[PDB]
């Protein structure tokens, strides 16, 4: 369940090389996999915790100045200096002013003057990092089989919750009758911290490309402040104005929090003060099957009074899924059920729940079915054939190939290399393909990284054109290079 009506999703028919599935999940998604035997499963990856973070650096959004002063000497004769300048906890500047004669000096012409200001930070913000070893994930997989817990329940026992930390590797999935999943996460090459900079603001935080968070302007600390205030800089903020030439003074300015956010814009949202748990995983792994029997198995096929409890709407695709009602045989009673085609048998089913199974005799329970393209009959087929429903999709197999083409592609650019992890067990094609993409990706289409939206599509064109009208053969490759790739990115980038 909780794998119906989510959009971020995909079906994985197969198990290859025996219990050998390859899957990737992007925090906000449901991963569904089918297999001739074993109740296909639903994988929801949620809370991805982290503990023991390094607060390296510490900028401040607000600033303030105190006990400011300033002085001069007289043209040339000395480059004026003030005592308190000693405590580098201030901020100062040497400037020139035509401090002449009557001014109260000596030999007019032009002189020096410095202003001092005891600095004071106000409402810093600070970042923080994490040792991969401490990225406590939470993956929760579960089996269907109707239930009141229906589709989408934020409570009950649902395939349990296997909290996984690379501080280990292979974990068991104890499932009531349903078996025991063997999951092997790849908590390391997933998101990729210690490359990331977990920073906050104030009850709102952000994950950020390291090499940036360690260069974006502002007056900083060190991640050892522990009573210091020797903000390397103090200069990025607070500025000195020299109106005309005299009363050369200093000033504080405004608490960047504003622009901060408004520059942190292109960056992903996150967590922090809620215990801290930076969402948005992009984690992959192997779903090891082997043990995953189909429960309730050893039971007849209980016949009798059947009813329905809802109609039949669908998102994902043919995700038509209907609940029923029952009275006939208490205890785990398998429920007859099919996917026939308009009267004339020659069924064409896509039953997606490895046989339902009634139970509580009072519990309505439901079912998950992927009917065909056009017309179709799902049939409860019980006693006198009791009930047959005809629904009707629209799933023209071709419109299918297309929306699929894209859909995958979308998941292509968003996972890069890793994307190929949906292709559980390759060899030659899918395997080498993953390979080629690896390098072809990391470089070139990722050798000019840092590029930007506009520019992106812009180069998409300028480049296609240096292509379009070229000179024999080669251009084909030039264009492609343009095609989708840059292009499709430019229109399908900016997360």
């Amino acid at each position: 369940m909780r794998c119906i009506g989510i959009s971020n999703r995909d079906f994985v028919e197969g198990v290859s090389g025996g219990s050998w599935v390859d899957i990737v999940l992007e925090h906000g998604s449901c991963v569904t996999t089918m297999a001739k035997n074993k109740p296909t499963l639903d994988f929801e990856l949620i809370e991805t915790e982290a503990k023991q973070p390094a607060t390296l650096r510490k900028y401040c959004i607000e600033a303030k100045l105190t006990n400011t002063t300033t002085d001069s000497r007289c043209p040339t004769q000395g480059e004026p200096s003030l005592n308190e300048e000693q405590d580098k906890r201030f901020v100062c500047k040497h400037s020139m002013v035509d401090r002449g004669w009557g001014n109260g000096c000596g030999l007019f012409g032009k002189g020096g003057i410095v202003t001092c200001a005891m600095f004071t930070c106000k409402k810093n913000m600070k970042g923080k990092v994490v040792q991969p070893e401490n990225l406590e994930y939470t993956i929760v997989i579960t089996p269907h089989s109707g239930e009141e817990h229906a589709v989408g329940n934020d409570t009950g026992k649902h395939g349990k919750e296997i909290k996984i930390t690379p501080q280990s590797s292979i974990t068991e999935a104890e499932l009531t009758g349903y078996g025991t999943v063997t999951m092997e996460c790849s908590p390391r090459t997933g998101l990729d911290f210690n490359e990331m900079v977990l920073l906050q603001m104030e009850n709102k935080a952000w994950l950020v490309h390291r090499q940036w968070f360690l260069d974006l302007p502002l007056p900083w600390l060190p991640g050892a402040d522990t009573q210091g205030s020797n903000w390397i800089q103090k200069e990025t903020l607070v500025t000195f104005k020299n109106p005309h030439a005299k009363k050369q003074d200093v000033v504080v300015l405004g608490s960047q929090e504003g622009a901060m956010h408004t520059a942190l814009t292109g960056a992903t949202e996150i967590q922090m003060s809620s215990g801290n748990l930076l969402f948005t995983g992009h984690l992959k792994c192997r779903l090891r099957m082997d043990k995953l029997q189909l429960k309730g198995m050893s039971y007849s096929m209980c016949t009798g009074k059947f009813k329905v409890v809802k109609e039949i709407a669908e998102t994902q695709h043919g995700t038509i899924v209907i609940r029923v009602q029952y009275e006939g045989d208490g205890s785990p009673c398998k429920i007859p059920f099919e996917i026939m085609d308009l009267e004339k048998r020659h069924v064409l089913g896509r039953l997606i729940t490895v046989n339902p199974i009634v139970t509580e005799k009072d519990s309505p329970v439901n079912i998950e079915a992927e009917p065909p393209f056009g017309d179709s009959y799902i049939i409860i087929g019980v006693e006198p054939g009791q009930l047959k429903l005809n629904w009707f999709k629209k799933g023209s197999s071709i419109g299918q190939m297309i929306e699929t083409t894209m859909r995958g592609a979308k998941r292509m650019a968003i996972l890069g290399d890793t994307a190929w992890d949906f292709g559980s067990l390759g060899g030659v094609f899918t395997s080498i393909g993953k390979a080629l993409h690896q390098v072809f990706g990391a470089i070139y289409g990722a050798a000019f990284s840092g590029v930007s939206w506009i520019m992106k599509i812009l180069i998409g064109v300028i480049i296609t054109w240096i292509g379009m009208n070229s000179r024999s053969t080669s251009l084909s490759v030039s264009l492609v290079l343009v095609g989708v790739v840059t292009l499709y990115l430019g229109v399908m980038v900016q997360a």
Partner: protein, 72 residues
């Protein structure tokens, strides 16, 4: 500052929307307009220097749009 060099180009794009997916990203061009309308002239100047500079037509067009966007 907290004005420029945001978090664009990095490369941590995800499955979920970021901090200002549509809004800001579109706002950029939104403002080039703001400006480019405000003060025609540079449009003028540009496309002109354009006209005589380069001459490959696509050339002209290119530094025209280009130059224009560069001018804050």
């Amino acid at each position: 500052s907290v004005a420029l060099v945001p978090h664009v180009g990095m490369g941590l794009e995800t499955a979920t929307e970021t901090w200002m997916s549509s809004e800001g990203a579109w706002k950029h061009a939104q403002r080039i307009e703001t400006w480019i309308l405000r003060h025609p002239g540079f449009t003028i100047m540009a496309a002109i220097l354009a006209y005589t500079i380069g001459t490959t037509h696509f050339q002209r067009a290119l530094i025209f749009i280009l130059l224009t966007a560069v001018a804050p």
